[PDB]
Q: What sequence folds into this?
């Protein structure tokens, strides 16, 4: 297990997401679905010039998986995935420059919901999650797990035994008071409100 | 000069953009600025692991250049640029799959302003332009010009004599009744309305 310090500006951003009073937390799902759609666009685009990039899976989709027993919401896509080097770049983000630009925007009247315009929308996961685990597989690397409970660090390790083929899984270990995001009715409502017209199918899995 | 047929679904999309009654044409600028911001994020991200990718220019920005004598509006960025192969892929888009998904969305109640969610927002240029010329330079290829006045085809040729260093210029040859988009007051209004909080600076050039 390798432990890395977050880029300072990201540590500050995460702090702001966790500590600022902001009731509209449901936008985390829009942001993670947007990231999945971007990852899916990338593999689709790459496949136009090299069809063998889909040998690791032809279906391009997003699955939403609530688990009330584990208190987790997982967002899975079959997009391009991330290499170990991507994960070491603050979970595949333009962390430093994006946060700096985002903070200047917040001072000029922007609000937290604009986070995705700055390339750091993944970190909106911390509106609802105490810990986030990212499992990912890119065609050019092995499967890895990235994890952070904030506090200024993240870990990276190889992930074996449950291979995915290609893509990214974002596992949200929800805060105790954010269990509404495990309810089917609530997830459907948020998808229709913010992610109604996406370039890929979204399947909401059922439990028990 | 090489001439290419558009992917059929793109030819249909362009037809729909040119012929459908839709008064909110100003969203073309939001879409082109969004594309520039995405291109700028890509070069910024690539530079995190290879700083020499900025040897072709360190400044990451967007310029908006109106020219009333030529009746053109140009959107310039210093993003990652496009290779010749990208241009041949319908001006660097997921043309086929994106248009198909976008058309299904329009039947389900989506409208033209959602075009950017489907990876084909560049084609919103045809809301206001009779012809579009794209000049582009990627670090791994030479400078090229892509052009189309719709009608089912586009051209690609090398572009010499006015080298850019790195990035993309989108030159909109405006329709005669769309000259409001050359007015400083109008461009400022549209940028503030739709692109107020972007991850990169936008400079609106002055004329005469």
A:
């Amino acid at each position: 297990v390798e432990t890395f310090a977050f880029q300072a500006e990201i540590a500050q951003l995460m702090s702001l997401i966790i500590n600022t009073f902001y009731s509209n937390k449901e936008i985390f799902l829009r942001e993670l679905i947007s990231n999945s759609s971007d990852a899916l666009d990338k593999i689709r685009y790459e496949s136009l010039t090299d069809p063998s990039k889909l040998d690791s899976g032809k279906e391009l989709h997003i699955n939403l998986i609530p688990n009330k027993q584990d208190r987790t919401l997982t967002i899975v896509d079959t997009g391009i995935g991330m290499t170990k080097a991507d994960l070491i770049n603050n979970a595949g983000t333009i962390a430093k420059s994006g946060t700096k630009a985002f903070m200047e925007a917040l001072q000029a009247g922007a609000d937290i919901s604009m986070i995705g315009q700055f390339g750091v929308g993944f970190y909106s996961a911390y509106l609802v999650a105490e810990k986030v685990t990212v499992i990912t597989k890119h065609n050019d690397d092995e499967q890895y797990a990235w994890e952070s409970s904030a506090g200024g660090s993240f870990t990276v390790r190889t992930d074996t035994g449950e291979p995915m083929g290609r893509g990214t899984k974002v596992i949200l270990h929800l805060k105790e008071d954010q269990t509404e995001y495990l309810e089917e009715r609530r997830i459907k409502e948020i998808v229709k409100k913010h992610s109604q017209f996406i370039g890929y199918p979204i399947t909401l899995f059922v439990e028990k």
